[PDB]
Structure formats: structure tokens, C-alpha cells
Design a protein around this ligand. Sequence first.
Ligand SMILES: *[B]([O])([O])[C]([N]C(=O)[C]C1=[C][C]=[C]S1)C1=[C]C(C([O])=O)=[C][C]=[C]1
Length: 263
Amino acid sequence: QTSAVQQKLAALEKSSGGRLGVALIDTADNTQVLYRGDERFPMCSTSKVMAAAAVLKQSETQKQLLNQPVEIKPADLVNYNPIAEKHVNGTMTLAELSAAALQYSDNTAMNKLIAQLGGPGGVTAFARAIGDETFRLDRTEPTLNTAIPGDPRDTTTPRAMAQTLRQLTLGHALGETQRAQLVTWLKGNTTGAASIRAGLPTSWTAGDKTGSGDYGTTNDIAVIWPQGRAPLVLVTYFTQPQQNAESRRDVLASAARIIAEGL
Ligand SMILES: *[B]([O])([O])[C]([N]C(=O)[C]C1=[C][C]=[C]S1)C1=[C]C(C([O])=O)=[C][C]=[C]1
């Protein structure tokens, strides 16, 4: 069946020129709304949530891990690293790297998280350990953003990512202290006001992680506390046919608005 909300999302997608993927979980009733929910999309920086969460999981059995210093060298800098470049020839802790990755989308910080986990496959391993059979991280920053149509590397589906985000932020995939820390980090994101949150009423609060990459790939994943009801988890992925396409955060905002209006 095709719902009114799915038809609206199809209409948005048609006018956008690209390919849109949406997954909502409403924790008021556990119901879901999906649009291309089982199609793969390049994650780009939304994968930084899984890496940060994997390090939080490791910290459950090492109380001092988040205070562990990591050397930042000139050669570690990649294409976008507004926090890490301030610490070259010094150190950042794994907490500082997690915060920088999540709240500023620092790509050097992400690479240090991936290294702590033993490479991209360590992030995938953590996904599998919390019941996500779909997620795959194959590369580091910045090549995980190539976003080539048809390429499975560094992809997931909207359905899988919404489920996982729910388990991480509202469920019990992490210990309570770690879940709270993840939520605190997401709520302090600096990059999200033009994406999902732009389509929500102002009164609502949210935490989110954006992503962007080649093929005009424009993504956001969010945990949302609407006015007067139980939290939502919402994933919005968008990708375009030309490698040099421009970002379309407005499409994510529009998808979020359709979802909000359909509640
Ligand atoms: B993250 O990987 O999406 C990250 N993207 C990039 O580094 C962009 C590209 C690299 C190579 C080809 S494209 C990133 C995300 C954000 C954000 O979420 O706002 C900001 C900066 C970098």
C-alpha cells in the first residue's frame, strides 16, 4: 500500500530530480513510515554516529578510555578538520574526537575513531553486534563520500539506520551513561538547522547528524522530541545523478515537514 504521506514524499522526490529515502519510527506506537526504506544510500558523515557509538561501547569496560590522548600529526589532516587542525602536533582525547566528529563533522576526528576501532570493518562489527545487518563502513574519510550510484561501499538503508539510531539513543544498545552522552552530543550538533530540523515546528527539540558527499548527497539522521509526545527517530537520505550536484538540504527539510504534518 501507498499512503498519503508516501505519495507526498514521491511528489517531493519527483520535483527534486534525485532519489529520496525516508524512515520514521514513532515511539508513541512503534509505527513506521518508509519511503525507499530498503534501498541503499551512501551514508557520508552520518556514519560518524556509528563510530562514536562504538567507542562509547568500548568505554563501558574502560572507564578512562574517553580521556585517552590520541596524537594528531600534520599528515592526519584531510579535507575538513576544523577542530583537529587546532591540535596538530598535540593530542585530543577520544571524547574530544567524538564531540568534534559529531558536532562539527570533523573528518580527521572520524578517522581517529575508525582507527581506535581497528579500521572501517570495526565500525561494521559494532553495527552487527547491535543487530544492524545492513550498515557497512568500507573506507575512511574522505573517500567514504564518493557516493557513486550503485556502489554498496559505505551505505545503509533508511529502515536499518532508523532502527539502529533508536536502539542507540532511546534503547539499550549502550549503557545508560553512554546513551545519555550520545544524546548530549547529538543535541549539540552545529550543522543541522537547515536539514530535518528546518521542517519541524520550532517548539520541537532534536539532536541530529548531517552528511554530505559527492553526487549532491545530502543526508540527516535525527532523534526528535516533539511538543507533547513521545520521541521520533527520522532518517532522510538524498542523492543525485551528477557527481558535481549541489547540496539540497531543503529537500530534507521538506521531507521532515511532510512527516511532521502526517502525524
Ligand atoms: B561527511 O563525510 O559527510 C563530510 N563530508 C565531506 O568531507 C565532503 C566530501 C569529501 C569528499 C568528497 S565530498 C562532511 C560533512 C559535513 C556536514 O555534515 O555538514 C561538513 C563537512 C564535512
